[PDB]
Enzyme design. Structure first.
Site, PDB file in Angstrom:
ATOM      1  N   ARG A   1      -8.206  76.525 -31.542  1.00 57.75           N
ATOM      2  CA  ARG A   1      -7.517  75.602 -32.353  1.00 57.75           C
ATOM      3  C   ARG A   1      -6.517  74.749 -31.576  1.00 57.75           C
ATOM      4  O   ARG A   1      -5.847  75.124 -30.636  1.00 57.75           O
ATOM      5  CB  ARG A   1      -6.796  76.288 -33.537  1.00 57.75           C
ATOM      6  CG  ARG A   1      -7.753  77.082 -34.431  1.00 57.75           C
ATOM      7  CD  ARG A   1      -8.465  76.159 -35.427  1.00 57.75           C
ATOM      8  NE  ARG A   1      -9.129  76.906 -36.490  1.00 57.75           N
ATOM      9  CZ  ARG A   1     -10.392  77.319 -36.508  1.00 57.75           C
ATOM     10  NH1 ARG A   1     -11.206  77.077 -35.490  1.00 57.75           N
ATOM     11  NH2 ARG A   1     -10.946  77.999 -37.508  1.00 57.75           N
TER      12      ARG A   1
ATOM     13  N   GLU B   1      -6.537  66.871 -35.023  1.00 57.03           N
ATOM     14  CA  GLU B   1      -7.903  66.368 -35.073  1.00 57.03           C
ATOM     15  C   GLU B   1      -8.193  65.794 -36.453  1.00 57.03           C
ATOM     16  O   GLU B   1      -7.669  66.293 -37.444  1.00 57.03           O
ATOM     17  CB  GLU B   1      -8.833  67.490 -34.610  1.00 57.03           C
ATOM     18  CG  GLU B   1      -8.767  68.780 -35.351  1.00 57.03           C
ATOM     19  CD  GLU B   1      -9.761  69.802 -34.830  1.00 57.03           C
ATOM     20  OE1 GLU B   1      -9.608  70.301 -33.702  1.00 57.03           O
ATOM     21  OE2 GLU B   1     -10.683  70.063 -35.621  1.00 57.03           O
TER      22      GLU B   1
ATOM     23  N   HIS C   1     -14.857  69.156 -31.920  1.00 57.62           N
ATOM     24  CA  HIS C   1     -14.852  70.439 -32.600  1.00 57.62           C
ATOM     25  C   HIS C   1     -16.233  70.880 -33.031  1.00 57.62           C
ATOM     26  O   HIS C   1     -16.570  71.058 -34.201  1.00 57.62           O
ATOM     27  CB  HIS C   1     -13.871  70.454 -33.782  1.00 57.62           C
ATOM     28  CG  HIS C   1     -13.431  71.851 -34.098  1.00 57.62           C
ATOM     29  ND1 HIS C   1     -12.331  72.092 -34.892  1.00 57.62           N
ATOM     30  CD2 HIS C   1     -13.880  73.061 -33.761  1.00 57.62           C
ATOM     31  CE1 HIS C   1     -12.137  73.384 -35.021  1.00 57.62           C
ATOM     32  NE2 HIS C   1     -13.079  74.017 -34.338  1.00 57.62           N
TER      33      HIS C   1
END
EC number: 1.1.1.237
Lengths: 312, 312
Positions: free
Chosen positions: A231, A260, A278
């Site tokens: 993360r 993000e 991601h």
């Protein structure tokens, strides 16, 4: 009487389809007046489907008095208020084990892409530059010291792959794992000081927020590479960008970012980073398994059967 | 009396420096009238240093009557006429073992870069596209069937890495290896038919020229990926490009090309390829070892000591 399921964000076409076939599906992200909407549907929504970007915080749970279960399309649950769910009798499920291999695979792919400059090489060929000379020499992966932050399922999977490249393995964890032959460090800074490659592979909690701080980055140093498949908020991101720009960190392979899908644009000009949107679990095969597991938990819950992958 | 060494092409700054310090270094590629030059230096040149792009064929050997040794900055020797060297009493050395790990590492890096679309993902982020949606789902590597053409040092190193990703391993070789637990195929086509990923990892000989032909490519098929870390002429390259363009092959990770550094420009538009400028051994660490090994062979030869890595 069809069962109301609130899907928080557009995480999977397939999952959306599968939920729409089975339940009364609400798409939260399509509602122009969301708070009006939650008021209108307070009595109809019995489940929430979240992911790593949108879950269920205390305010949402309070707004959904008939909520019975939060099923997350993720292994992580940092976006779900577990304490609050437990307090309210709300069940929580996730997607354990099924994404481990893809996430660990991506860590190794990032390592090779950074150290061997695979993305830069490919850009170099496509602009015709090879006709005028060879690409610069890069950095050998096999044999380099790999440090891992977290030695749970994903950290172990990364370690086991890296061992096949003859990499000595070291790790940090709150407590030493007695089970392993890898080198335990009691400090993230000391780990970083003794790593060529540092991999973030732990859940996101308050305690691990900014676990990669300036001191850690500088200990990893000008010839070290940071790999983040965890993360975004695991890293003090403005300090990471500064360190890369100023030569204080050797490189970075990043799948996740603090805000993000915003990625600091200064990174776009750097040849010693690899930036991915991601995609750790983002394969056809794994996302299908994850989606089916979300559906299977919801069907078990509403049919009075034991859940498949409960957490709360 | 300083010893003449002809270096065929500009393969390594470091090696050039190390040869220039020790010997009378001639740089062949800088001479505007090369045949004039070979005539002028016929009596002075006692060694040739080559690599995978320029070696020593029969005509060059004939032109260098005082030639005693050809030291190649490569493990492969397809650019050296071994038969002719043996016939003339010329020694040949190479660089075995020292590049195995980097080349095998790059095969795995290519696999991940193609299947997980790492290069495409990175381009997608840098053009700002993530702000408008997620990247498409890609393909899981772990567990996929990996077929390897050649099970010598590099093929085994690729296999051993891929096994750590839970990949079942199959291979083709002239003869079955009794030593291994991998699945032997007696045909490249049958191997290809039973591979998700096909890796070329054998030396280049007449016999293995175009070992990847149209029939092999079509057997690998629309969901298969070709990885070439060998040599460009292992593949019928115009058939590979056609197959990629037309959807008959799923993807390709290519470090080598038939007429390198020319790369067919049609490939530059394809998202399902990764193209590298022959960087398999191209790390600071491995090229230094290779260079030192070339120098060490030459010093042994001219000091009457046994060679380090002779082939002939």
């Amino acid at each position: 009487e069809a069962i109301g399921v609130l899907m928080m964000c557009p995480m999977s076409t397939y999952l959306e389809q599968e939920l729409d076939k089975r339940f009364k599906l609400f798409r939260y992200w399509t509602q122009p007046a969301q708070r009006d909407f939650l008021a209108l549907q307070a009595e109809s929504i019995r489940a929430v489907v979240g992911n790593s970007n949108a879950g269920a915080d205390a305010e949402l749970i309070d707004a959904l008095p008939k909520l019975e279960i939060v099923s997350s399309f993720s292994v992580g649950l940092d976006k779900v208020d577990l304490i609050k769910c437990e307090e309210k009798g709300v069940r929580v499920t996730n997607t354990p084990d099924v994404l481990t291999d893809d996430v660990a695979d991506l860590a190794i792919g990032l390592i090779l892409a950074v150290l061997r400059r695979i993305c830069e090489c490919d850009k170099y060929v496509r602009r015709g530059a090879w006709k005028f000379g060879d690409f610069k020499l890069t950095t050998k992966f096999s044999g380099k010291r790999v440090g891992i932050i977290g030695l749970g399922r994903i950290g172990l999977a990364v370690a086991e792959r890296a061992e096949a490249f003859d990499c000595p393995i070291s790790y940090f964890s709150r407590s030493k794992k007695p089970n392993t032959n890898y080198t335990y460090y009691g400090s993230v800074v000391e780990l970083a000081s003794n790593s060529d490659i540092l991999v973030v592979a732990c859940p996101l909690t308050p305690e691990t927020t900014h676990i990669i701080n300036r001191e850690v980055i500088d200990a990893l140093g000008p010839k070290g590479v940071l790999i983040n498949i965890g993360r975004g908020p695991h890293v003090d991101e403005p300090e990471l960008v500064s360190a890369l720009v100023e030569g204080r960190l050797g490189g970075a392979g990043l799948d996740v970012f603090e805000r993000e899908p915003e990625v600091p644009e200064k990174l776009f000009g750097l040849e010693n980073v690899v930036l991915l949107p991601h995609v750790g679990s983002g394969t056809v095969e794994t996302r299908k398994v994850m989606a089916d597991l979300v559906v299977g938990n919801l069907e078990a819950h509403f049919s009075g059967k034991p859940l498949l992958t409960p957490v709360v």
